[PDB]
Amino acid sequence: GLTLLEKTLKERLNLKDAIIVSGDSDQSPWVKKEMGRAAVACMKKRFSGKNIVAVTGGTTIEAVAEMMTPDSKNRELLFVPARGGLGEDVKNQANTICAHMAEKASGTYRLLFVPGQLSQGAYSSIIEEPSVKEVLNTIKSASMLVHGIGEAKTMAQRRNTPLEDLKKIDDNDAVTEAFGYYFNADGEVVHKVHSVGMQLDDIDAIPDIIAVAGGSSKAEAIEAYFKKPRNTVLVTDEGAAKKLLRD
């Protein structure tokens, strides 16, 4: 079963399960690929006959997508982004990762097409539109969520974060981020990126949540994110886990 390290991590972070691959992805870049491989195997163990898989962007979930292969059980797979624009560049956007993962899985996918510099009026018009509402409804019915976790400062800087929001993130001592929410050390939301789709309150209804995040630089972010019960499986590496656990 679990190693002592995995067992300790599960207990410390109140995880549904812990999956720890060897090495430190901050040292040892290819370790991110090994997290991806392990995450893909974890997803396959969890699939039901039909599945609606919501995904975030970021480089770690892109590694999940890169390691994705078709399901030998041939279960029904529909992929969607978890949320609309989060300010990421194209290679990091949930829409990009979603399409890549679905293609690799030989599944189907839907995208959220919500710009992106357009007006308030135009914005509200886009989100009321039938095809968009359809995708929003699909995300609301997700059976699985696969998501990254990042350091708050790092993520705020990588994205196109307004200066007033950077100030708010700093002033409120955000230390971690996931799916467009920034959290403090006690895992409480302190700032949220406005975006349609999945909300934090919605994750409780999703049967299988798999977080994929590692590297020693993220040990503090991961600990803080899991300070609240998330009922989540964490795929991580020794770099993060040993640092977090002081081992």
Ligand X SMILES: O=P(O)(O)OC[C@H]1O[C@@H](O)[C@H](O)[C@@H](O)[C@@H]1O
Which parts of this chain interact with a second copy (CB under 8 A)? Answer: 85, 89-91, 95-96, 99, 108-111, 113, 115-119, 121-122, 125-126, 128-132
Residue 150 binds to ligand X (criterion: CB under 6 A): yes
Query: Which of 1, 121 has the CB closer to a second copy?
Result: 121
Q: Does position 226 bind ligand X by CB under 6 A? A: no
In the bound complex, what is the minimum distance in angstroms from residue 128's beta carbon to a second copy? Answer: 7
When asked if residue 92 is in the footprint of ligand X (CB under 6 A), the reply is yes
60 interacts with ligand X by CB under 6 A: yes
Count the alpha carbons within 13 Å of 172 in the hemisphere toward its beta carbon: 21
Residue 111 one-letter amino acid: L
What is the rounded end-to-end Cα distance, in angstroms, of the chain?
20
- Cα separation, 116 vs 203, in Å, equals 25
Number of residues that bind ligand X (CB under 6 A): 17
Q: Least Å distance between CB 121 and ligand X?
A: 27
107 forms part of the interface with ligand X (CB under 6 A): no
Give the ranges where 159-202 is alpha helix by DSSP (H). 163-171
- Please choose which of a second copy, ligand X, none residue 156 contacts, taking the beta carbon within 5 to 8 angstroms, the exact cut-off set by kind: none
In degrees to the nearest 10, what's the CA dihedral of 86, 89, 95, 99? -160
CB contact set of 68 (below 8 Å; sequence gap of 6+): 40, 100, 101, 104, 105
Shorter beta-carbon distance to a second copy: residue 22 or 141: 141
- Chain centroid to Cα 110, Å, comes to 17
Q: How far is CA 177 from CA 91, 108, 185, in A?
A: 19, 28, 11
In the complex, least distance from residue 214 CB atom to ligand X, rounded to whole angstroms: 9
Binding flags for ligand X, 164-193, as an x/- string (CB under 6 A): -------------xxxx-------------
∠ CA 102-107-109 to the nearest 5 degrees? 60
How many Å apart are CA 97 and CA 114, to the nearest integer? 16
The one of ligand X, a second copy, none whose footprint includes residue 110, by CB under 5 to 8 A per kind, is a second copy
Residues at the annotated binding site?
A: 57-60, 83, 93, 158-159, 177, 218
What residues line the site for ligand X (CB under 6 A)? 56-60, 86, 88, 92, 147-150, 155, 177-180
Binding site per annotation, positions for beta-D-fructose 1,6-bisphosphate: 57-60, 83, 93, 158-159, 177, 218
